[PDB]
Amino acid sequence: MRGSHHHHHHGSATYTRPLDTGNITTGFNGYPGHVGVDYAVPVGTPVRAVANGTVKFAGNGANHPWMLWMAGNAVLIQHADGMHTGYAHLSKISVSTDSTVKQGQIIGYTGATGQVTGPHLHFEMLPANPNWQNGFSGRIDPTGYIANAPVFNGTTPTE
Ligand SMILES: [Zn+2]
Known about the structure:
The PDB classes it as hydrolase. By secondary structure, this protein is mostly beta strands.
């Protein structure tokens, strides 16, 4: 068995960026009524916490009935700023409601427990307390969390 003792300072990432952004402020990629963003990625891939906080929701797909469930696996957590972030269309959860979380921590596994077409990732970010009084529905751009994310082939601006 292999065992690690020392950790890295910067951190590695062999996974590529499925998107560049996601905003339902103008018009979504054919997904109407969407309050988040979706990234086509095969089911069973470990989902890590994009930022430390607290689990406000943990919809475990391991024992979830279809009595009160239809979307499948979901995870709502309060980020480091107090904002909210959901993780939907997963196949499993490693967390639990009211439990504390940490960035990069495996909070679940990707899935397709919603509609049967293809597995993906749903990332919805909202304020600490939204103003659902029309305007944004509290849902905004994940670009703030994707800027500190890995590199897809290498996107240069000029130089
Ligand atoms: Zn979605």
